[model samples]
Target: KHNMKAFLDELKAENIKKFLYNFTQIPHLAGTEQNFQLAKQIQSQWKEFGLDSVELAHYDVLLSYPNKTHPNYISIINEDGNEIFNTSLFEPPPPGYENVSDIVPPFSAFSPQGMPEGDLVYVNYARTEDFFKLERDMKINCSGKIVIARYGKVFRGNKVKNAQLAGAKGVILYSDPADYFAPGVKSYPDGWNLPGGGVQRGNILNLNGAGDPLTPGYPANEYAYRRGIAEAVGLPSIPVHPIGYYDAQKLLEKMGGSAPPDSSWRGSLKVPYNVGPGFTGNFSTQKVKMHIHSTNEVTRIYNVIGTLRGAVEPDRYVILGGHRDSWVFGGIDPQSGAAVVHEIVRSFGTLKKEGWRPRRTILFASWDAEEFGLLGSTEWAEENSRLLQERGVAYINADSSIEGNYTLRVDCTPLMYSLVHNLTKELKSPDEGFEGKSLYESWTKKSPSPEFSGMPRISKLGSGNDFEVFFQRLGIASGRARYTKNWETNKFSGYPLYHSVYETYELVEKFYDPMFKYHLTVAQVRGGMVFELANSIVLPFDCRDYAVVLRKYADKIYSISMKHPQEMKTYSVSFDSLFSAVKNFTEIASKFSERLQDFKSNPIVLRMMNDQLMFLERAFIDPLGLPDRPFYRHVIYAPSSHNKYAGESFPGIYDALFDIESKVDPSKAWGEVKRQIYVAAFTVQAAAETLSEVA
Candidate 1:
């Protein structure tokens, strides 16, 4: 351990900077020629090092493109059939945007083509509950009208889907000044605030599934079965487009009806923020057209994989990854993570040069098409599922490595919580002089509530980044560490150019992560984590933490039950069975951890003990998958089907409560929940059986 950490200390920040500049030099949207070229470049770099094996893995997948035949357009019209604002609605790149013609337009990927014309109805944020209230209290009938949604609150795909469920004719989303920032603030080129012309591009594919839209359960390999376009699992059935807030304001100012959509719906665009089906005064009976004509194609996306096989326990594995594809230049997002990957690899290469080999194989991956709904990683996981299920230990991912430097944020499976905290505790804090505390100590101070109680916080794994399939599907431990702003020291409201052309080298160099000090610290953290996971005789996992977390989730659902006791009749989930099983797991886990008090002294059955710890996560996965959401097999944790960005703990019970609240098929939903509760108990009991052999 000391030798590996010492070797990693020799890594230089200059090498990381050079690679960072090289990778961010080109705009590499997935399925584009530039993205493939960059993958090959990373392959060559890894080959230059002493990695034992390196390969470019490819998968055929569906991707979106705007072609010459049908370009995207949006227009506003008056009652007299006069054009209020007409032309292509896509936001164009700013001054220094190179090769503007090559850039993908500002339209949501997978948005279907159509000319959907109707009066606009403003649905603030358009989240699920917002729609519920609109239908019940405010009586906003979304049918036949274009649902206008702001792009900040939830996943864009989710908001669009919510509109579709409400019978909306079409959807048009924009980044609002209220949620993004006000107009008077310093815009980009001078600072980080979004200007009137800035736009956020994204994947609008349904969150219920990921990877190739045409192929849901299987990888898009040659022998794999594929689905027809009409039968695709997550493809959109309605047309959707995106515009800058400036263009939104133009159409919104002309709108009038209802009562200004409540005070909470107000944006900084200087309009009344009406919930209008048509304009008042001049254009009282007018409508707008959301015309989209885009092409969807099946293309191959590539992943760069480099392997350094272990001397002992060669089949056991630890994996590290960063997504290679980006929306624009991707300076802060993936390229920063890519830079970290390079530095970590270089550190490992130095160890190989010194004839030091780990006890387990380490696989370093630079994934492709992650921006388009985690394509490369998901396909790769599915293709190798058999092998991974047998020997995989954990996966660590870094996406959008540095946002700001004040604090570190992490999301992981409970097994990896102690691993991350123990590693960070060794590194000195980037901020000086608070008695020279470690990074872990600094993080503890940032989150000081007694609920977590003197332990480093570990947020739950959710459906985002490359870790989704690993943690949620295969039940492998995965996580990432990142630095964000203090918010008090830096009042910079938002990075509006998030999926825009302006998230370039300029933004990182001028506003965010200047000097790249945090980048170096983050790289060291990654190297240490991989080295420890690969080399330790006993896998560095803490199981009691998982038990603690499961109990908290149980308590959470109980609170929900209290919030709506009247609705409790629908689901029979009191968690008595779950509590007994988890308590059994907690006791056994404490015994296994305590058995480690004299671990090195009585190191018998090391392989058996290690396997027990490694397979504990798989206990959470139910083979049949969650009800209605087949892609998410883990019963305890999944991205909410209604709100895809937020995590749903004990989703079976959690989401069934939704059915009870909404009074939609409560009997069937409760049936699913009641069955899942037993399955969860059995799985927890199965884990106890797996660990019982540690005796």
Candidate 2:
């Protein structure tokens, strides 16, 4: 019955390795000739794999880049008016990668071009709380400063945004050793830890809108309505540059001010963590400044989309996607995931050759410009919003299939929780010395969940990936599955050479996955998940699981609200109605699951049940969107405004309540809280009705 699984078991690692090598051969940034060539290659490869249809979806989007001819850099001016120090804007490519073409210089994407000169202020990770502490606790004014922040904790965009909010004229970001290097680990070329010249490049668009910045809620198609660049929101007004720690240490060492009161605010830098608004010692009369001449233009980007149409439910879709563009040689960041996608397609093509057909269509989307704020996937999803909202079953994203070799980490909606666990149980562990154990067994042993049952934790889907559109916007069930490093064992906070030239095929072959077994394992697990979601008679979604998580979120919100009784009393806010609504949803969902029994032969009856399951997630979306973040429509789950990568459940109610403490007048925020409470309660009730069986 499951012959495809047997074929999947025979999947090879060498093939994935080859695909990865091809993808990482060149520096294929978005809107580049090299990336366009890669898109065409993907289109051709999918057709050769016997996919039903393969198409190149093109969109003209606004993308940013540093000057190709002249690099952007920061320099220190001495008291004598001499150039005391200057940064090398480019990271020297590794030994064999020296001649690679079109290597992008370090610059924050979407940052405005300018030459901003001011005294440097060290803001730790430049998080909102970091800025708050500097002003409130440390009593340091950040206005009229060039803030230097290390890359860690929050998304880079948020860091820059907070700096701008603190009145910073420019921002400098670097990967601190504390976050980029394991203790006693050697630098890259010698070891996997980041070298002194490694600078992490990334986009700095901090808005909730994930797609083309010009076309807010719509696609960037031929005739699509376009807005002026000046009209676009979230584009940074300040100049932002990313330099290697070699340059960062220069600026931090000369910073003049009080040392950070909190030890946690410090990093691996030898210098004391300072709340500086100026330079120290000989540089006291000098200043830290930057020269940024970045360019932003509307250019064509491609999305190589391929489909394996199903025999019975061609309209239904289970999408498996990954970005195609890279900052430099995007070896592990995206190519690793792209390599995994290609193998999955090839394996399914083999199944198609054997006269096997899935019950639902599967889409392989090689998204473009993901590094430039998820441009490709966002635009495509926006263009196909209506069609997707009608037929999209679930989205499985692999932005980077394996960041580390520790264990599988899955972040998905509650409905797909059991499906992930079951899939892992069927796969053999890819790690050495685990010959007889299942992947699930290895995972649980290494990283057990904190819960009493000790089931491995599956996180809620957050923004910052291709899944953002499908999950946060359309309210479709979405997930990101990856094999990540064990943070406990690996002392580094992130992949050491992420977005750098060192993230090469050689690194993966030598360190990340020596034999490529982990890559193959990820493909197998992800492909199997797609098959089960597409082929199962029952949709395999467990609404009971969703209800359980919903109760937990409700309890969490209630607890948060209880902490401010006086505020709640003054605002006449109560969680009684919210609790009542949750109770109703819980009872209805419990009954709804009881009715999802096996259907003997009626196709219409089976589809009706599946539709109910599918539409239940859609019911959580509010067409108008949340408070200020208009693009994110899901009430149940959204990326946190404070941290783009962090998940915030019941975002509408949560954000509103969260704002009360930050706002000058809490009355308006309290009003929003009351409205959000109603919105969440009603939405949950609507979702329950969506799951209700027809008489």
Candidate 3:
């Protein structure tokens, strides 16, 4: 506690705030000159911070964009064949913004180049299940109809891709006030909500394979072979566009024939929600033409990597990262996280001046093109796959670090659960005169559900943040320490205005974090986690924690199987072998954890144990990867192929079974499911064997 207390106390909030100011003062969209300049500044700063080594790794990756000479626009035409609702869909920068008009307009990146036209259809939130409701339940075939989906439930790119798969001719996405605002909430400029005219711009980058779309299975190095757009696995084939709610209303209001969507489909918008074909006899819904123009260029993106080599084990690494690029100012999204990284680096510099050296190496990274589907980090991680897989111990990140101020939010793997819980238990809360109470105490009192009350709840790693590539694709243990208030329960507002212009410097100062306390708190928690990982002697990769979480997920699988026997059989899945392997793993892991308590201190033994712990996550990954989605290899956890945001444990078996529309021809999927079940069990048994060797 003495060493840790001193470390935490040394983190100055003012230093982080200064960096935050530096990041938000101007725009830094990926591929822009401004973004390039900012990347260099961060590189120079890292060098100045006394890092052992610093480098600007460059990759000529394929990225898409839209600029001023030819911007995107959406037009609504009625059955009367008139241009009823026509307007530019691009969102303008907020008042007093610097010369950032060059920011790419609100066009979905990676969308196929075309201006397709069709009748507008309202598809609720455009979630996978919603598609089922429209097709399977209601008999609405969206095969040819274009969909105008309100955003909220899933990643925007996923919405476009799902619509494309459902046979929709095109897709239009918009930020629904229902999500960004409530009944009484006011909007930005006046208050802290998304204005009706606010448009949230983001790329429709396919999540199937991260990094540059052109190079799916390999790194996007200068000499790497690139695939053409037609062969790019994840890039969408249909035209996709994003519009503001004001324009969205013009199209949605004209939709007809949809029985008022069940309550779940309803939104906070003033218009009565309906699945529309735009033919309400008299009110005649309008036909829409989305004029979207975008181009893909193989250009260079920058990633700044700075390292403080470990005194004891320089080969091992503890990584701290956050994206530096944004569509606009990116104040809350990437900038907040970037600022926190800067401060952590600065604090470590101070420690070095005091003649202190960490036992394990620390790597700090500032990424570019993250909003375009985590391009920068993904490329760098892919390029350094060999060393990263060998030595990467833990990767910590904080995106949109301060969306609110009430509570500390952590989304992590079970291996990190106990570590986070213990760390928070020692730290004092920063808000509500919370100095008297530790963060763990405030967490329990704030919302005490037995499952999550006693400790920091462990959230399954999911896509949508920068940690996805590290955790999902590579099977590295990772998490993001975030400061998000339960403004919804207490009620307030949220973000791709995630990638929109409203994400300016004014946003955090005015709506999110006025005092910068939340920013400091996030930095404190994330920085503290990095410190623990870098300084720990045992490597702290808890096997018991892994076993504990695996048990719950296994229970869920069995509990679900009991009622859905037919569904289970459709995939020819059985849990007997999985359960058997899990039981053995649990027993061995418990013995190993117990042995660790009376831990021997031989240098080679310590290295052996660390190696085993580090490699446990890798066992979960299969070389061939998942059946349909081969890019995602981890069998224990992967984003549900249908919904990119939610984590699906044993995703290979789960997605194939659930996403299969009909059980009529289940043989092909059955084989895949059966194989994955055995493979998942094999990984668990292999991991137990690795840990057994250590103890």
Candidate 4:
């Protein structure tokens, strides 16, 4: 005889107090050997608290690629023999022309091997569209020329891949200080800033194809049969490196060219930005002593899997996860969320100690190697794909949690919208006036405190976290969660500290989570959500919400095509078909939802619902894979085409749309939209059928 209100009240008080106390004790950073140790410690702590079956699952990871040190690197020189020794000089050479003589040695790790000296050319950001345009509009041959591109437009890998496609030999990326350091540019002493001369270094693996460069479909085991380095599709064909604004300024100053960059393309450098082969002279450079060192090592990475078997539906699972790896300290990027995860686990352990067993199994995972390219979780998921498909119901993820505190955001299958709405109501803010109010209401209240009212809307899920593989590839009803106060400020705020040495505990303590109060709230929210999901008799999915969001995506695509008809024509047929399928599917999904309302509580219905829930993510999986990229099976969300770390939503369709619009044709776009609608319709119908069968 428990009073539901009283029970919840008591649980919240105890959990919050305990969470605040415990969060301060855990200081974990991913991939520094400490993250693995923390995972073990977490398991031990969970077991000590009487949770059943806490285990550390080991996965093999190749910790290869030692740090490189070189003196007297190549330098890019102008035709007049004047040296462009600063940041701009580091731009990558165009494809097929790897012969530069006077370039400075780059300071990036794992840069590709190439012959460097070549004439200099500017290609903006080297996005797929940019390369296509350069070939068509300028009729300029990029072969044997160095390409200088800016950062910020696309993922770095996409830029490299596009350059490789356009016949460029090498690539160089540089940050413009003018974006952050120039007069009137907002600057915070302790915030995101890239001083001149800083170089952005990262892997150039074409993530659209496979995951890790070493392992394709299989886990990167010592015994796994690997492709030859030269034969690997994921690795970049040209050398790539990042340079700071200081170096870029010098290069721009020396450049002589016609057609100065458009206003939008202008950067912080005082010199006029331009696409150069300048009247002053052609820029030339080359790399010396470039070679690939062995990139295979034996390292044991662990994933922490804590399972609380369901009393009735033990086989069905509600999965919640986040990665435990970072480039540096990763305090704000991951530790913020990781700390919250530990709090949730501890809370669950407390409840279990009090004899609470969920109705459905719940699994908490701390994934590894996410920084490199979702290596740890991707491998684990692939290895267990069959079993997971059979049992997994939903996956909720929390990554890069920090700062904003406003309205809650959920990027989930439509079936979960109402569930999220309901959950938001049940949770209360610690602030007295905010207590018992929905997160949305609190944020926009006229009299609400500045802290609450100033918060931003929660963002939709895209890619770049542990959830990417599950949601985009596997088609799981997945989402990433965060709590923030101000969305606008948070988006533009100290994000530059991401993946940098500045992402430290001191920074978190000072700016990110000064009091650990938000950390406790995140834990409580996630813990409560996990508990409810694991106990629900029927997998709680609001199909109507799914239909609604899908409709929005479809309509957006149609509008884009209608607005840019000429651009739509150049897009591939497959792209047009996919969009069309998605649209048609939403219409059918509407009918399925009406049928589902009838079977809401039947156990058989619940089983059918669960099966469908597991299958939702499966629609995107292609056994044959996407064109030229066999490892990547999903056709939706992925890391951006030019930037490896940035995420792009509806990538295949969007990329195609960009392509077609440039060609000025919209007829083909409608067909692609139709195809997407059809595919979506099938998935929706399958889900609807499961609901009807269970009902």
Which numbered prediction scores highest in TM-score against the true structure?
Answer: 2
Q: For model 4, what is the C-alpha lDDT against the true structure?
A: 0.57
Candidate 1's C-alpha lDDT? 0.79
Q: Estimate each model's TM-score.
A: 0.95, 0.98, 0.95, 0.79
Collision count of model 4: 105
Per-residue lDDT of model 1, residues 1-695, tens digit only: 43655756876777777878888877899988999988898898787777888899999998887765667868886667666686444455655664555667778788888888888888988888788868887888999999888887678888988999999989988888776663465778787777777778888888465578888878998777778888876777888888888888887887687875467677778888888777787776678987788878988999999999998888988999989999888988789889889888877877787788888999999999988889999999988989887889989897777877667777778888778888878887776454478888887787543476776566776676788888778888787777776645433333556887778777876777667767887887777788889998889888888888888887787677667554455455456888888889888888877765445444446777788788888777877888777778777789877666667898877776664656667667667666767777787777777777544
Clash numbers, per candidate: 0, 0, 3, 105
Over 554-671, each residue of candidate 4 has an lDDT whose tens digit, in order, gives: 5665666566655444443333544455555556556655555565346765566566655655655555554455554555445555554454555555555555544444565556
Ranking by lDDT: 2, 1, 3, 4
What RMSD, rounded to one decimal, does every model reach? Answer: 2.4, 1.5, 2.3, 7.5
Greater TM-score among 2 and 3 belongs to: 2
* Higher-scoring candidate on TM-score, 2 or 4: 2
TM-score of decoy 1: 0.95
CA-lDDT, candidates in order:
0.79, 0.86, 0.77, 0.57
- Please state the error at residue 419 of candidate 2 in Å: 0.7
Which residue runs does candidate 4 get wrong by more than 4 Å? 1-35, 62-110, 132-141, 178-192, 197-201, 278-299, 403-410, 429-437, 442-460, 484-494, 560-602, 617-658, 661-688
- For TM-score, candidate 1 versus 4, the one ahead is 1
lDDT of 2 by residue, 534-612 (tens): 8887897988888888889999998888888998999999877777777888898888777676346887878898998
